[PDB]
Amino acid sequence: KSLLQQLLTE
Amino acid sequence: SPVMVLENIEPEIVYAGYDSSKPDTAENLLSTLNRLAGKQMIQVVKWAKVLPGFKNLPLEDQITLIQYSWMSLLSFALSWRSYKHTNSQFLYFAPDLVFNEEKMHQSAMYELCQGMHQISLQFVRLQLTFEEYTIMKVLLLLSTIPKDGLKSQAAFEEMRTNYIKELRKMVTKSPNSGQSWQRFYQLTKLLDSMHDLVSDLLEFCFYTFRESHALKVEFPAMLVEIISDQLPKVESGNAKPLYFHRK
Numbered sequence: 001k002s003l004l005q006q007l008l009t010e
Numbered sequence: 011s012p013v014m015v016l017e018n019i020e021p022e023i024v025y026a027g028y029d030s031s032k033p034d035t036a037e038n039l040l041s042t043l044n045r046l047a048g049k050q051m052i053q054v055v056k057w058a059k060v061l062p063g064f065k066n067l068p069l070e071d072q073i074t075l076i077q078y079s080w081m082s083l084l085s086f087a088l089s090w091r092s093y094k095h096t097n098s099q100f101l102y103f104a105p106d107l108v109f110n111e112e113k114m115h116q117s118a119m120y121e122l123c124q125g126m127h128q129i130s131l132q133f134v135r136l137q138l139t140f141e142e143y144t145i146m147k148v149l150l151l152l153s154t155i156p157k158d159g160l161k162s163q164a165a166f167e168e169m170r171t172n173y174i175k176e177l178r179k180m181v182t183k184s185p186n187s188g189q190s191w192q193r194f195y196q197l198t199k200l201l202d203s204m205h206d207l208v209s210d211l212l213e214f215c216f217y218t219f220r221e222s223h224a225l226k227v228e229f230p231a232m233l234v235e236i237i238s239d240q241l242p243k244v245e246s247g248n249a250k251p252l253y254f255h256r257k
């Protein structure tokens with residue numbers, strides 16, 4: 001999981 | 011009211027963490043700017059999540075839009091901070107990092123800095139309101155798509171059209187004769203003029219990223235990820251900038 005993916009889904 | 015939501019979700023100001031005791035070289039100023047851009051990008055992602063209509067777009071498209079527009083959002087917010095805090099006399103990156111002529115020179119970015127300063131001088135000329143600014147920033151998040159379109163093109167177009175409708179209703183609050191069409195076209199023109207300045211900032215970005223250690227310029231993790239993905243797509247011509255008024 002990418003940093004952008006992590007922040008958008010958290 | 012979507013515009014009132016925009017006003018309340020506008021991210022709080024962040025410090026650059028600038029070390030004035032260190033030599034004012036291009037490598038140290040650029041590294042401070044990169045660190046600041048990293049923090050601001052985390053804020054941009056948290057802002058996009060709570061943006062009305064943004065959650066309707068699939069995850070892949072949300073990522074695509076953030077990655078294509080990041081530079082546009084950061085530079086537009088810089089111009090607003092510059093206009094609000096210094097009446098566009100200086101470039102207000104953060105409260106601890108305000109660029110004057112000396113810093114524009116030391117950063118090896120003088121012509122780029124002057125180009126941004128011109129955009130902020132347009133904010134003074136137009137007397138840009140916060141309401142207009144917040145709508146325009148959403149339009150910048152939605153102004154660059156892949157050449158072959160998004161996964162959910164119709165969902166994107168519906169969101170973009172609705173924020174264009176919001177900007178049009180907002181200009182009626184600032185009339186001349188009582189007309190507002192003039193202001194609306196001055197705003198769409200100012201939006202279009204962001205693509206060319208951002209094309210130049212990205213060219214500088216990509217060069218400094220390809221030669222970062224040789225130039226002693228540091229990049230935070232958020233930027234490494236954004237740039238590694240965006241650099242091949244932009245250089246291959248896979249980005250499609252959306253203009254209100256074709257050149």
Ligand SMILES: Cc1noc(COc2cccc(F)c2F)c1-c1ccc(CNS(=O)(=O)C2(C)CC2)cc1
Pocket residue numbers: 040043044046047050081084085086088103119122123124126127211212214215216218
């Ligand atoms: C932070 C931040 N607050 O606004 C901006 C707007 O960008 C500008 C940066 C410098 C001069 C200007 F006139 C700008 F308009 C940034 C920002 C900082 C670093 C990076 C990545 N580094 S980079 O090499 O691409 C470079 C070309 C900006 C320094 C991207 C954005």
